[PDB]
């Protein structure tokens, strides 16, 4: 309120993890949306809402297609930071 695939990719994010590496559902979703452009329809649960969810749909044969999309998503989608740079400690 204020055409697409019947197959849904639904992922649950960890509130505790989403905080230590400061992130918003909005900004996470934005990365996915900006990665797959107009060939993936993304919706997401609000930062307020109890469970943290991202609902995704594509634009015969679709099962394997989505299993590739979830691998791209977990392994290739960079949210924050610079590549090769892990564990950043603050030091006085």
């Amino acid at each position: 309120s204020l055409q697409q695939s019947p197959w849904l990719l639904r992922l649950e994010l960890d509130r505790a993890a989403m905080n230590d590496k400061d992130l918003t559902m909005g900004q996470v979703g934005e990365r996915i949306k900006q990665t797959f452009k107009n060939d993936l329809f993304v919706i997401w649960s609000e930062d307020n809402d109890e469970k943290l969810i991202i609902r995704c749909r594509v634009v015969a044969e679709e099962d394997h297609m989505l299993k590739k999309i979830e691998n791209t998503m977990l392994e290739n989608i960079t949210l924050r930071g610079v590549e090769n740079i892990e564990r950043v400690v603050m030091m006085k």
Binding site: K67, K68, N71, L74, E75
Partner: protein
């Protein structure tokens, strides 16, 4: 006060030193390092208690890394160049339908986690559907190749009987035993990859054996007696040719 425990060879005393080796017939799972196609391996150093001692080590390989799609399970069989997808091996063994195959690997029908991990293997072995076609597929991959249809299917039979899991039995009708074992191995391979069990401690003393004066002489006497046995045969030919008594 002299305590014995040595030999006297040409007048000097000699002590056999115990040699430490890794115990055989032992299932061990190890994570194969960061740059590798295979993420984890199930190894079994199968050898006979006595009799020739076939040092054929079976590797059950989990292809694909933690975060790679199509994580298949293949196994390198003695005298076979390629690693055969587990499924085809079970089929060549006689365990033909999926789920009958899955029953040998996963023991809990509830455990969806391990079962999803077996779906790729089922897809990999989907091509081969009967026992015969499984043995041909194994027979195709030589050896050398050994061209002829009757020949390759007959060869697969022999490898599974004589070179595959030689402890247990090297006898004929024991497919059921060797299938459940392979399934116990895949169970252990997946159990470690699912982070439920720890990688095997290669340095646990319980997994090491000490070859003392006994077995050392036994190892030597074997190769020394087969040296004599096959020199008598060379004589029986020489003395049957000329009937030289």
């Amino acid at each position: 006060f002299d305590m014995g425990g040595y030999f006297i060879i040409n007048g000097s005393e000699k002590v056999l030193i115990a040699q430490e080796r890794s115990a055989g017939n032992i299932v061990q799972v190890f994570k194969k390092a960061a740059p590798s196609p295979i993420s984890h391996v199930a190894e079994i150093r199968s050898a006979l208690e006595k009799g020739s001692r076939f040092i054929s080590t079976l590797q059950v390989k989990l292809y694909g890394r933690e975060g790679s799609s199509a994580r298949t399970i293949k196994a390198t069989l003695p005298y076979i160049k390629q690693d055969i997808p587990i499924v085809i091996i079970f089929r060549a063994l006689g365990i033909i339908p999926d789920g009958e195959i899955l029953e040998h690997i996963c023991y809990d029908v509830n455990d969806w986690q391990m079962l999803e991990m077996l779906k790729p293997c089922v897809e990999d072995g989907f091509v081969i559907q009967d026992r015969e076609t499984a043995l041909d597929f194994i027979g195709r991959r030589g050896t050398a190749l050994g061209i002829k249809k009757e020949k390759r299917i007959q060869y697969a039979k022999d490898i599974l009987q004589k070179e595959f899991l030689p402890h247990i039995t090297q006898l004929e009708g024991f497919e059921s035993r060797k299938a459940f074992f392979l399934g116990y191995m895949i169970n252990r391979l997946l159990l470690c990859a699912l982070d439920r069990k720890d990688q095997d401690d290669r340095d646990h003393f319980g997994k090491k054996r000490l070859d003392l004066a006994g077995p050392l002489l036994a190892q030597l006497f074997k190769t020394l007696f087969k040296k004599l046995t096959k020199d008598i045969f060379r004589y029986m030919q020489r003395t049957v040719e000329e009937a030289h008594d």
